[PDB]
């Protein structure tokens, strides 16, 4: 069943700015935190396929300051976590309850609090909204080598893609293919992304869609988050009643 956990944060300095593109080194700190506890569970945690997923930070209340960052006008601010494995899940808990500091570029977090979130019924159908990007993307022609191409929910070629990526990773997390493989979505809200990732861009899109479909890879998706990079803070969704 996994479990999806709330990350209050409190930041240190009175209305910072946090740079846009804090993915990779806020990855790296989660991981290096879990693995002080439990270094067993690093591989899973890096692995490409993955074994979990993160949101972006969520501000309620901030200011996009053009090439600066993001300005945080309130104290509410939550990361949400979440993987189908509890023991991903405990080895980070550990691992923030005894390191409880972040840093986002100038700007210094203290957890502020760890609340585990009740997680929802996964249906045949279900409306999701992002928490973090989806990623889904394919391979095209660029000189003498493959370069990715990340695509949108517009693209013809985006739901066939979807599908393969969350069936390679079903397998290799699960350990065997979902008995149910087919699904559908059908797009409610969208906004394309652009973050740079450690050194290269990842497009994604931020999007509310209707799934149809295999319960199996719903609650997949739902635990572990839909498409690629979910590992680097991608994929993830919540689940709303009517929106």
């Known amino acids: 069943g996994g479990m999806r956990i709330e990350i ?42 993955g074994y979990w997923t993160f949101s972006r930070i ?19 601010i939550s990361l949400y976590i979440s993987s189908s494995n509890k023991e991903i899940i405990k080895g980070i808990v550990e691992g923030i309850e005894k390191s409880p500091e972040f840093k986002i570029g100038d700007v210094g977090f203290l957890v502020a609090d760890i609340k585990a979130l009740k997680s929802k019924e996964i249906k045949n159908v279900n409306i999701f909204s992002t928490l973090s990007p989806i990623v889904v993307r394919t391979v095209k022609f660029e000189g003498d080598k493959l370069k990715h191409w990340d695509l949108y929910p517009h693209d ?12 390679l990773r079903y397998h290799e997390v699960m350990g065997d293919l979902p008995e149910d493989k087919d699904f559908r979505i059908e797009l409610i809200k969208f906004k394309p992304t652009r973050l740079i990732v450690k050194d290269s861009y990842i497009r994604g899109s931020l999007m509310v869609f209707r799934y ?19 590992n680097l803070g991608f994929g993830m969704v919540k689940i709303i009643e009517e929106q």
């Open 8 to 49: 209050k944060l409190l930041p240190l300095q009175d209305n910072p700015v946090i740079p846009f593109n804090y993915n990779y080194e806020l990855y790296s700190q989660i991981v290096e935190k879990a693995g002080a506890i439990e270094p067993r569970i690093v591989k899973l945690l890096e692995s490409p396929h």
């Open 156 to 167: 013809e070629l985006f739901l066939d893609r979807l599908r393969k990526v969350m069936l």
């Open 212 to 230: 149809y479909g295999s319960k199996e890879i719903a609650k997949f998706g739902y635990e572990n988050g839909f498409g690629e990079k979910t």
């Open 58 to 76: 969520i501000i309620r209340k901030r200011e996009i300051i053009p090439e600066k960052g993001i300005k945080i006008l309130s104290d509410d």
